[PDB]
């Protein structure tokens, strides 16, 4: 009887006999991959390790990770929670706006901010000008 896996990356089955005889244990585990991220954009281990060098510290085990294995709930959740779109900050680079981050469209000098949300969920942002007298 042989025990082989469908996909070597998703499922890992190893048979050992660490009892020096007659006791054959079959270890069945799920190989999981880690999801990385940078500048609000999700990256794999190999991509982030090979393409980016600045400000990032990637381990050797994560460096060889090409993201072909499965993922847990926590990994996905944290990945999305660290992912989003970047906005240009004036004072002159970029700031990462992830999911759940509050963005307030306020009014300033001689302007009137009007941000509305329809029942369909569609967002309409509009600025007005006030000219009296």
């Amino acid at each position: 009887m042989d025990f082989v896996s469908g996909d070597k990356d998703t499922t890992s089955v190893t048979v050992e006999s660490k009892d020096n005889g007659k006791r054959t244990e079959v270890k069945i585990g799920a190989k999981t991959s880690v999801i990385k991220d940078h500048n609000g954009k999700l990256f794999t281990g190999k991509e982030l390790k090979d393409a980016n060098n600045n400000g990032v510290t990637v381990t050797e085990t994560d460096g060889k990770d090409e993201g072909n294995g499965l993922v847990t709930a926590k990994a996905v959740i944290d990945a999305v929670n660290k992912a989003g779109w970047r906005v240009k900050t004036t004072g002159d680079d970029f700031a990462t706006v992830a999911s759940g981050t509050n963005v307030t469209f306020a009014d300033g000098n001689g302007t009137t901010a009007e941000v509305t949300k329809a029942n369909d969920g569609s967002i309409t942002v509009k600025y007005n000008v006030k000219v009296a007298d």
Copy 2:
């Protein structure tokens, strides 16, 4: 022959002999975790159940879920589709999820101009309207 699993959270293997005498069935399954969300931010079961109290009803089974198990496609899809960034509503916050249309329109004495570069980068610019 022994049948043990690598990780108890990702994989669950149970050996039983309930199917009558001499018939020993080995059930091998993958333990999956559920993904929750609130205000466009993804939370685990335990996180959503324990941190937030208002307007939310989380079951006891989901309350103990720490998200150490695997996840299915539909769960991830719905989670992302219920996740996004919040905007201040002037009338108090509104959740902007994936795929929802955000229209930058112009109003009184203003001119909306939203352009899309080849890089995919969006440039939003407002103008003032002074004719004659």
Copy 3:
């Protein structure tokens, strides 16, 4: 002696034998593909049955209801192609995905000011330029 799986969609266990005496047991994990359209994530069946325009979905993915597990690449590719749409005046709509730079620039008689607080909260304000 039976080898059965808990969920047929998440886990697949098959016992096979080509001639006599060699019985191999293949255990693999059935994975589902995550699709997307207009920045919104869809399953295989949903995209295939509900959407007709501009999209070509295979039959194997057409029956996919997204009940199986997912790999890292699938999730990563799915999220990075998902996001929120903005009205472009050229018009129509434009899909803004994750990691995409959105610059609030100033124009005629306007002054753009986008600031980021310590909380990470973004405050965008427009000013008027009257010299």
